[PDB]
Amino acid sequence: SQAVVTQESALTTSPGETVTLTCRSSTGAVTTSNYANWVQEKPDHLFTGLIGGTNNRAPGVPARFSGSLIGDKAALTITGAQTEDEAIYFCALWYSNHWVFGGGTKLTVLGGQVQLQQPGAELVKPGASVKLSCKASGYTFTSYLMHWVKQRPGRGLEWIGRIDPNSGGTKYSEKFKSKATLTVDKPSSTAYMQFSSLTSEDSAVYYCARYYYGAYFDYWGQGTTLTVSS
């Protein structure tokens, strides 16, 4: 059975304070081999990778964000919170051949180029199939793994799997191992995810995100909203 990754459900801070968020593994201590990543969700479904590899901050992220290990947990510290830091923060831990996302922490702050291009939506019938696309622009598609993530209300982020665009090699989560089909087309720098026999259980926003070994989920697509409805 897959590990459960636990985050505080909600924390409150105020402008100028230092605040720390944590990410616990059900299997034992979080270590550097879990390559802890931190991703920020801002309104309008805007995701940005902040930290990966435990403590490696992504380019362009404000320096007040830092990652460490504390108390057998991964920890994100915001040193001097700003009003715009009010957001949901997800961690992700690597377990040898899959990522697991934590449930997210809603941070309230009281008092306040590279593109991954995804179509906005798919409206499909129950029982139908769909092929979701994610076109990479502004970087070398074959140099990064392409990950896919599902977001449903009350269910956080859920890692589906990833593809190596150089080989088409895939790794899936247990939940998606017999469900998602990932492919790429190299000449058009596009990644695809196919599903069949869809139901309302599949209605969600699906994101692609790039990753480089030891680094971070820096850039995310805007998400395709899949609505499975008669």
Ligand X SMILES: O=C(O)CNC(=O)Cc1ccc(O)c([N+](=O)[O-])c1
Residues contributing to the site for ligand X (CB under 6 A): 35, 94, 145, 162, 171, 211, 213-214
Element (H, E) at 12: strand 10-13
Select the residue whose beta carbon is closest to ligand X and give its number. Answer: 213
Nearer to ligand X, 14 or 166 (CB): 166
Backbone angles phi, psi at 126, to 5 degrees: -55, 135
Between 74 and 81, CB nearer to ligand X: 74
Compute the C-alpha angle 54/170/147, nearest 5°: 45
Q: Nearest approach, Cβ of 161 to ligand X (angstroms)? A: 8
Q: Measuring CA to CA, which residue among 97, 68, 225 is closest to residue 164?
A: 97
Taking the complex as a whole, the smallest distance from the CB of residue 11 to ligand X amounts, in Å, to 27
CB atoms within 10 A of CB 136: 25
User: In whole angstroms, how close is the CB of 86 to ligand X at the nearest point?
Assistant: 29
Q: Output 2 or 83, the one with its CB closest to ligand X.
A: 2
| Of 35 and 207, CB closest to ligand X | 35
- Minimal CA–CA distance to 48: which of 33, 58, 36? 58
Considering the complex, what minimum distance in angstroms separates the CB of residue 35 from ligand X?
5
For the four alpha carbons of 175, 177, 181 and 184, in that order, the dihedral sign comes to positive
Smallest gap, in angstroms, from Cβ of residue 34 to ligand X?
9
Q: Specify the residue, 94 or 139, whose C-beta has the smaller distance to ligand X.
A: 94
Phi, psi of 3 (to 5 degrees): -65, 150
> Ramachandran region of residue 54, left (φ > 0), alpha (ψ -120 to 50) or beta?
left
